[PDB]
């Protein structure tokens, strides 16, 4: 066993550094048709009432 | 420095939280963040000259030929590994025997909400663009994606009794004045629907289960990628439920491929072959490809963790 | 008298220490012309054995497409050293194996070595 | 369709076909909210678990 | 200088290539390049007259007459050159029992993504015009070739319910 | 696939007009793969010629490690060109020799061609 085929692809290269991503990217892009909707005036399908 | 890249996602919670007066701690939320890391690849083409004196005689100015030979090869080699690492292994996909507007609408709602195939609940993919619009008066967000059809499936869905339903509505309506009339599919459900060719040994295309395995596997990095599930052995998995090959689309969100490094070329004259009498012409390229699927850092279950983040596949019988 | 011919030659070599089992050996591009493959037993395999090795491909069932080795305790001559029959152009990129069975030896090996040419051909003149 | 097509004879309920909406239904906007899945808010379907909807 | 012509293609590279460490020189592309000769050929027709007493008896002005009608004479047999040549041997072709446009989107699909009859491979066939268009903002190149149908398909075509 | 593969290969020929002694044919250098020694016998031996050539190493007593050649004038036919079956890997600088004895003859010559290739590898991926 000396020559023989190594399949070790590019990820088995002792030279190369990794390097991680600047930002960590979010998952989460999705808004929602329910912040349109509530409000506090009398008129709205989802009304707010102040209560302090 | 284009040392192999890894780009982290942080995934969103899920967790049912604590109630009145439960503690915090009686269920914490995991902060669960997920990597890929991305390997550059080499791959590069030549051509030989003949002798000056031959060259001159057969009129073939060689280097600019070859300059440009070798670039068109260079853009269709790397546009074909693109595509060869967008369409292997499918997590996510849905099968029809014929495209149709109709499940290209069931795909961009399975995009919109995070569903599979065989309605699961995956993930929400994250579209190419998402704007606020108002419907009278409440604000909605619509999502454009980017739906690439085999010309298998473009033809296909040219001849969908619902597709000349809408092409006639916007007629009337007037707003993808020209498609119809230029050949092309248009926009439907704020998507631009698009014929993206036919995969064939001289560009790039979506593929099909005609293309030999070792002809698409040649285009996989093999370590930016986990599994390998080839157009054939796709066809393969999909007929264990007749022998019909099949051909591949997909509905792209943003960044469903991943290119690290430099996809710039490089180009190397030699103009010392034979002691300066024939001539060599290289073209090289360094660059990692590989489809956006990113894999627990730690070692949790997510419905992120081992699954295409933004690629659905669509899959007709190519006929 | 114009031609196409192929310039450019490699030879590979080898080792295997003939346990059982298959070795990857030899990794040929495609449209390469195999115009030599041999091998070559470094060892005394002692009398009363039953190692069996055949130098093939690894996509085909069997494994002896290229060279058959058995009976490695007769006649120590014509067992050393084996050279194929056969040349091959490689119609995709393949894998020369050696398969190795019944192997009831110590300290034998096998060095395969492979000389073939490249698929690039450049036009000649004579 | 048909009333998609008589919108677009007036010309009123202009892009709510050509970006996948609903648009106006008699003076009332219809509006796709959404599935209810373990990660946002959406209408709610007999798939969900009684217990994951009481809480 | 009319000459027998010769023009040339440079065909499109195929082939590997090299990946990694190998060397260039492991697989060599072919630049090839393709010819055709083409050769002229003379042809041409004649209208004799009758004796000028018949000529002018009959007020028949011979070379006016003669003249225009060998001009349309012509325009056919060089169309009819064309024609044959153009229709002679195809090699890549769609049979149909009636001229649909389903055929028609066919014949233009394939001749843009280099494909036969049997889905066999083929090159992609240049068209007349290209042009590259925006949908949404993804840049499509759209194709324009030429469908030259005689008057029964063009019948067929005019039949045809998607038509 | 990586595999390291010897790029360069020199094939040396020699002549020797069949006197008695030994002949400094080939030189290799240390790490050349001997792929293939072969000779060739130009002239017509004479009958009963019980000449006998062997070609081999210089620094082996016994100098036959490639090629032995006996009875130069029985099957003439399969005895003008014999091929070598052994291939070899040069640990030190090596001289082929051939050492011909017995030598009763006249215009008889062997030509020597040993193809090898050179100690240089190189990493090729397929």
Same mark, same amino acid.
């Given at each position: 066993?000396?020559?023989?085929?190594?399949?070790?692809?590019?990820?088995?290269?002792?030279?190369?550094?990794?390097? !991680?991503?600047?930002?960590?990217?979010?998952?989460?892009?999705?808004?929602?048709?329910?912040?349109?909707?509530?409000?506090?005036?009398?008129?709205?399908? !989802?009304?707010?009432?102040? !209560?302090? | 420095?284009?040392?192999?890249?890894?780009?982290?996602?942080?995934?969103?919670?899920?967790?049912?939280?604590?109630?009145?007066?439960?503690?915090?701690?009686?269920?914490?939320?995991?902060?669960?963040? &997920?990597?890929?890391?991305?390997?550059?690849?080499?791959?590069?083409?030549?051509?030989?000259?003949?002798?000056?004196?031959?060259?001159?005689?057969?009129?073939?100015?060689?280097?600019?030929?070859?300059?440009?030979?070798?670039?068109?090869?260079?853009?269709?080699?790397?546009?074909?590994?693109?595509?060869?690492?967008?369409?292997?292994?499918?997590?996510?996909?849905?099968?029809?025997?014929?495209?149709?507007?109709?499940?290209?609408?069931?795909?961009?709602?399975? +995009?919109?909400?995070?569903?599979?195939?065989?309605?699961?609940?995956?993930?929400?993919?994250?579209?190419?663009? +998402?704007?606020?619009?108002?419907?009278?008066?409440?604000?909605?967000?619509?999502?454009?994606?980017?739906?690439?059809?085999?010309?298998?499936?473009?033809?296909? @869905?040219?001849?969908?009794?619902?597709?000349?339903? &809408?092409?006639?509505?916007?007629?009337?309506?007037?707003?993808?004045?020209?498609?119809?009339?230029?050949?092309?599919?248009?926009?439907?459900?704020?998507?631009?629907?698009?014929?993206?060719?036919?995969?064939?040994?001289?560009?790039?295309?979506?593929?099909?289960?005609?293309?030999?395995?070792? =002809?698409?596997?040649?285009?996989?990095?093999?370590?930016?990628?986990?599994?390998?599930?080839?157009?054939?052995?796709?066809?393969?998995? &999909?007929?264990?439920?007749?022998?019909?090959?099949?051909?591949?689309?997909? &509905?792209?969100? +943003?960044?469903?491929?991943?290119?690290?490094?430099?996809?710039?070329?490089?180009?190397?004259?030699?103009?010392?072959?034979?002691?300066?009498?024939?001539?060599?012409?290289?073209?090289?390229?360094?660059?990692?490809?590989?489809?956006?699927?990113?894999?627990?850092? =730690?070692?949790?279950?997510?419905?992120?963790?081992?699954?295409?983040?933004?690629?659905?596949? @669509?899959?007709?019988?190519?006929? | 008298?114009?031609?196409?011919?192929?310039?450019?030659?490699? *030879?590979?070599?080898?080792?295997?220490?003939?346990?059982?089992?298959?070795?990857? *050996?030899?990794?040929?591009?495609?449209?390469?012309?195999?115009?030599?493959?041999? *091998?070559?037993?470094?060892?005394?395999?002692?009398?009363?054995?039953? #190692?069996?090795?055949?130098?093939?491909?690894?996509?085909?069932?069997?494994?002896?497409?290229?060279?058959?080795?058995?009976?490695?305790?007769?006649?120590?001559?014509?067992?050393?050293? #084996? #050279?194929?029959?056969?040349?091959? #152009?490689?119609?995709?990129?393949?894998?020369?194996?050696?398969?190795?069975?019944?192997?009831?030896?110590?300290?034998?090996?096998?060095?395969?070595?492979?000389?073939?040419? *490249?698929?690039?051909?450049?036009?000649?003149?004579?």
């Amino acid at each position: 066993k000396l020559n023989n085929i190594n399949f070790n692809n590019i990820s088995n290269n002792l030279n190369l550094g990794i390097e !991680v991503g600047r930002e960590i990217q979010n998952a989460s892009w999705i808004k929602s048709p329910f912040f349109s909707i509530t409000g506090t005036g009398a008129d709205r399908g !989802v009304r707010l009432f102040s !209560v302090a | 420095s284009q040392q192999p890249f890894r780009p982290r996602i942080k995934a969103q919670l899920s967790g049912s939280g604590v109630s009145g007066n439960t503690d915090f701690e009686a269920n914490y939320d995991n902060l669960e963040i &997920l990597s890929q890391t991305i390997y550059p690849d080499a791959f590069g083409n030549s051509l030989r000259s003949k002798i000056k004196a031959y060259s001159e005689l057969e009129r073939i100015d060689f280097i600019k030929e070859s300059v440009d030979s070798l670039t068109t090869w260079m853009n269709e080699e790397r546009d074909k590994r693109i595509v060869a690492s967008l369409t292997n292994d499918f997590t996510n996909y849905l099968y029809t025997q014929t495209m149709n507007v109709a499940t290209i609408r069931k795909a961009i709602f399975h +995009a919109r909400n995070g569903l599979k195939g065989d309605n699961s609940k995956a993930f929400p993919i994250k579209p190419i663009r +998402a704007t606020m619009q108002s419907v009278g008066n409440v604000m909605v967000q619509n999502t454009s994606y980017i739906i690439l059809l085999d010309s298998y499936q473009a033809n296909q @869905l040219k001849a969908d009794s619902e597709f000349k339903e &809408l092409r006639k509505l916007y007629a009337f309506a007037g707003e993808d004045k020209g498609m119809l009339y230029s050949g092309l599919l248009g926009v439907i459900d704020n998507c631009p629907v698009i014929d993206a060719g036919v995969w064939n040994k001289f560009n790039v295309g979506m593929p099909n289960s005609s293309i030999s395995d070792s =002809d698409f596997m040649r285009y996989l990095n093999k370590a930016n990628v986990s599994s390998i599930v080839t157009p054939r052995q796709f066809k393969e998995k &999909l007929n264990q439920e007749i022998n019909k090959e099949i051909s591949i689309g997909c &509905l792209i969100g +943003a960044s469903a491929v991943l290119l690290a490094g430099s996809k710039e070329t490089r180009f190397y004259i030699d103009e010392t072959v034979d002691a300066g009498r024939k001539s060599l012409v290289g073209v090289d390229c360094l660059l990692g490809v590989s489809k956006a699927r990113y894999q627990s850092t =730690d070692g949790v279950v997510t419905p992120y963790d081992n699954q295409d983040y933004a690629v659905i596949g @669509l899959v007709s019988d190519m006929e | 008298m114009k031609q196409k011919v192929h310039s450019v030659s490699y *030879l590979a070599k080898a080792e295997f220490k003939f346990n059982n089992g298959v070795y990857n *050996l030899v990794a040929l591009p495609s449209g390469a012309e195999v115009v030599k493959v041999s *091998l070559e037993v470094v060892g005394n395999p002692i009398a009363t054995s039953t #190692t069996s090795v055949s130098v093939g491909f690894e996509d085909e069932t069997t494994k002896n497409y290229f060279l058959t080795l058995d009976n490695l305790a007769v006649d120590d001559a014509s067992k050393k050293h #084996t #050279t194929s029959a056969k040349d091959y #152009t490689a119609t995709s990129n393949k894998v020369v194996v050696a398969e190795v069975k019944n192997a009831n030896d110590n300290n034998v090996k096998g060095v395969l070595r492979v000389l073939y040419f *490249l698929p690039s051909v450049i036009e000649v003149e004579y």
